[PDB]
Amino acid sequence: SDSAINVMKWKTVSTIFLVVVLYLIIGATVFKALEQPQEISQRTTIVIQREKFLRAHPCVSDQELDELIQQIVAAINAGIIPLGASSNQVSHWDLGSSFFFAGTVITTIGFGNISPRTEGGKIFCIIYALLGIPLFGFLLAGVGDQLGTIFGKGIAKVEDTFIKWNSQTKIRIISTIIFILFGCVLFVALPAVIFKHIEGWSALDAIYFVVITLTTIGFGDYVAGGSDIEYLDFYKPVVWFWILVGLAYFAAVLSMIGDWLRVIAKKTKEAVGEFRAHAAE
Amino acid sequence: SDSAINVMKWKTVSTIFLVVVLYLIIGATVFKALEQPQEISQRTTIVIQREKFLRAHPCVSDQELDELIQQIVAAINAGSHWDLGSSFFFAGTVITTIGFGNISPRTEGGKIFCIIYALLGIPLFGFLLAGVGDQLGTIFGKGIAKVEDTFIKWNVSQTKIRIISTIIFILFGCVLFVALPAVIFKHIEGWSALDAIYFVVITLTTIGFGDYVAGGSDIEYLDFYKPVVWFWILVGLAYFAAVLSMIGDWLRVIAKKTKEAVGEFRAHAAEWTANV
Numbered sequence: 006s007d008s009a010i011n012v013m014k015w016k017t018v019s020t021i022f023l024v025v026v027l028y029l030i031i032g033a034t035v036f037k038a039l040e041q042p043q044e045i046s047q048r049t050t051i052v053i054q055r056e057k058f059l060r061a062h063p064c065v066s067d068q069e070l071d072e073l074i075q076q077i078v079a080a081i082n083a084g085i086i087p088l089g090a091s092s093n094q095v096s097h098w099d100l101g102s103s104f105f106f107a108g109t110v111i112t113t114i115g116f117g118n119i120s121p122r123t124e125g126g127k128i129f130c131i132i133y134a135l136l137g138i139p140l141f142g143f144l145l146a147g148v149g150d151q152l153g154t155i156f157g158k159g160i161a162k163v164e165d166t167f168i169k170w171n172s173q174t175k176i177r178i179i180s181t182i183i184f185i186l187f188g189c190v191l192f193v194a195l196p197a198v199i200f201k202h203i204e205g206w207s208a209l210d211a212i213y214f215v216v217i218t219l220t221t222i223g224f225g226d227y228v229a230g231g232s233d234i235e236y237l238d239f240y241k242p243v244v245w246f247w248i249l250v251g252l253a254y255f256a257a258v259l260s261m262i263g264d265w266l267r268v269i270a271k272k273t274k275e276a277v278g279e280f281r282a283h284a285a286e
Numbered sequence: 287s288d289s290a291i292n293v294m295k296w297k298t299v300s301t302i303f304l305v306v307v308l309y310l311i312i313g314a315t316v317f318k319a320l321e322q323p324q325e326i327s328q329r330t331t332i333v334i335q336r337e338k339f340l341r342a343h344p345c346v347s348d349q350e351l352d353e354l355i356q357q358i359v360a361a362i363n364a365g366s367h368w369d370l371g372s373s374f375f376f377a378g379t380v381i382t383t384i385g386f387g388n389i390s391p392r393t394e395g396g397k398i399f400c401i402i403y404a405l406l407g408i409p410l411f412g413f414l415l416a417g418v419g420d421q422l423g424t425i426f427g428k429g430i431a432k433v434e435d436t437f438i439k440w441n442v443s444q445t446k447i448r449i450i451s452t453i454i455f456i457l458f459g460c461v462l463f464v465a466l467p468a469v470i471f472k473h474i475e476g477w478s479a480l481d482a483i484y485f486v487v488i489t490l491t492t493i494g495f496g497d498y499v500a501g502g503s504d505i506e507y508l509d510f511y512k513p514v515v516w517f518w519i520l521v522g523l524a525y526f527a528a529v530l531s532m533i534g535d536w537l538r539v540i541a542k543k544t545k546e547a548v549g550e551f552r553a554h555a556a557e558w559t560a561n562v
């Protein structure tokens with residue numbers, strides 16, 4: 006029965022779909038709860054700064070001020086810092102920042118602090134992506150395998166010495182804790198400590214950047230290297246290598262959580278089973 | 287030899303690594319080629335707009351202008367952005383990992399909630415998107431059951447018709463998932479021809495720069511539009527996941543061919559050299 010299993014699939018997909026829809030509603034409501042306050046409190050305190058310099062210089066047209074701000078905002082997206090005290094500046098598409106940008110594309114982090122304006126760039130980026138993404142996948146699978154058997158040598162020693170009197174399936178719980186623990190050391194903690202001390206970011210700002218970068222949501226609200234500071238150039242290529250491996254590690258993490266959410270479904274599936282079964286005597 | 291196979295692994299990974307590294311250098315050089323010009327040409331034509339606004343409105347001092355720019359820069363860090371709908375959008379950007387980032391959490395809590403929202407939401411979404419991939423997958427399977435009987439009872443027959451089935455995937459696919467939505471984005475947002483195709487590939491590859499975001503301007507939006515784009519993403523993502531996988535498998539073959547092509551090149555060479 007080829008279509009009997011497919012009916013059992015749609016009943017699965019539709020149920021999940023509604024879980025996601027609900028999860029989007031939960032997230033939505035929590036975010037507009039978290040962010041509506043700081044929005045209106047910065048919105049109300051920006052029209053203080055507007056009407057302070059609306060009435061301080063009426064000799065400028067006053068309708069043109071909002072035009073001017075839109076002219077500055079539009080040029081900000083090309084990467085400007087327009088100032089009287091500073092008119093000579095770095096490039097956003099230098100030898101290195103374009104190489105960064107290839108990175109943002111093939112990883113699909115896509116920070117977007119750098120985005121192509123040139124019609125050609127867009128078209129080259131389309132084609133650069135569609136081939137580069139699947140390409141990178143192989144590197145990242147390879148680095149996942151390489152890291153995968155690396156940690157396999159770590160547990161071969163640990164699953165023999167901790168073989169005292171009394172199990173197989175229970176030491177599977179202890180191996181996974183040491184993954185997540187030692188993992189979140191080199192790939193979340195240690196790089197966050199370095200970003201904090203190098204970029205100058207907060208404690209959370211650096212952890213947040215790490216999860217945003219290595220999940221590959223990559224907002225761009227934080228980008229490591231993106232200010233003009235100094236940069237030791239021991240720094241820049243370490244972060245490349247961090248991403249390369251960090252991505253691989255998170256791909257496992259997110260898969261692990263994926264498989265956790267398999268079980269927790271099967272458990273709540275069976276837990277609804279027993280809840281329906283007893284049903285008030 | 288447990289380490290003889292592992293040396294054959296690292297020789298694979300390292301060779302790929304250098305392909306990617308080289309590919310990054312190729313892309314880099316092409317982008318700085320494409321984009322260095324438009325950078326300096328917009329940089330030089332923005333200090334025209336600066337020094338025009340001293341001369342066209344001397345009312346403003348040179349000193350208050352740098353205050354003004356700092357007032358704009360400070361407001362850039364804020365960006366309603368977090369209404370009923372735009373936060374729901376933002377959950378979408380997170381669990382899909384498109385992450386347009388036109389909306390990003392400023393609140394310490396938002397960041398922490400977003401970390402946790404992502405780590406659980408991403409794997410969750412994966413299942414929906416796998417389900418929609420399966421559903422779409424057997425949908426197109428019914429499309430080729432009809433097409434692999436009418437064209438396989440006459441001319442140039444099978445395993446080469448595997449080439450013709452995959453062209454009709456990519457063709458009919460790029461119709462509902464690249465063309466048709468790009469046509470609608472062009473006419474709704476007001477974007478160019480390329481701008482809409484570019485947004486599509488950027489959104490559905492999930493690079494999601496954010497330089498284009500469908501819904502992200504303050505245009506009047508029909509209550510038909512917003513939830514169509516959701517549904518577009520939901521399916522569009524699935525379709526591209528296949529596409530990018532297909533290209534992935536293409537790059538398997540081309541490697542195996544150049545692997546074997548180096549094999550024969552070394553083989554005739556090394557035996558030519560050896561006779562001496």
Ligand SMILES: CS(=O)(=O)Nc1ccc(C(=O)NCc2ccc(Cl)cc2Cl)cc1
Nearest residue numbers: 097102105108109112229230231244245
């Ligand atoms: C605004 S800027 O572009 O002009 N400044 C720079 C910004 C970032 C980098 C860089 O390479 N950072 C490490 C890195 C590597 C690969 C990937 Cl994929 C992502 C990241 Cl974050 C360099 C210059």
Ligand SMILES: CS(=O)(=O)Nc1ccc(C(=O)NCc2ccc(Cl)cc2Cl)cc1
Nearest residue numbers: 366367372375378379382500501502515
């Ligand atoms: C600058 S703004 O945020 O305040 N304005 C808006 C921006 C976007 C939307 C919206 O609903 N887009 C549809 C959508 C949904 C989910 C995903 Cl993953 C991608 C997309 Cl394109 C609405 C308002």
Ligand SMILES: CCCCCCCCCCCCCCCC
Nearest residue numbers: 208209212398401402403405406
């Ligand atoms: C200061 C750093 C904040 C990070 C706090 C850790 C959050 C990680 C939670 C992992 C997801 C499990 C949520 C459990 C809800 C039942």
Ligand SMILES: CCCCCCCCCC
Nearest residue numbers: 024027028031273274277
């Ligand atoms: C964050 C909560 C999302 C899932 C709802 C739980 C009920 C399970 C339905 C069987």
Ligand SMILES: CCCCCCCCCC
Nearest residue numbers: 128129131132479480483
């Ligand atoms: C309108 C520009 C489209 C170009 C990219 C489409 C794929 C063809 C590249 C070989």
Ligand SMILES: CCCCCCCCCC
Nearest residue numbers: 301302305537540541544
């Ligand atoms: C060792 C694998 C060589 C891979 C070559 C990739 C070809 C891309 C050409 C567009």
Ligand SMILES: CCCCCCCC
Nearest residue numbers: 124125126128129316
């Ligand atoms: C817009 C033209 C790009 C051509 C790329 C070819 C580089 C080998």
Ligand SMILES: CCCCCCCC
Nearest residue numbers: 305308309544545548
């Ligand atoms: C972009 C072309 C890469 C060619 C390298 C092939 C080495 C086997």
Ligand SMILES: [K+]
Nearest residue numbers: 114222384493
């Ligand atoms: K992204």
Ligand SMILES: [K+]
Nearest residue numbers: 115223385494
């Ligand atoms: K992004």
Ligand SMILES: [K+]
Nearest residue numbers: 113221383492
């Ligand atoms: K992504």
Ligand SMILES: [K+]
Nearest residue numbers: 113383491492
């Ligand atoms: K992906």
Ligand SMILES: [K+]
Nearest residue numbers: 117224387495
């Ligand atoms: K982005």
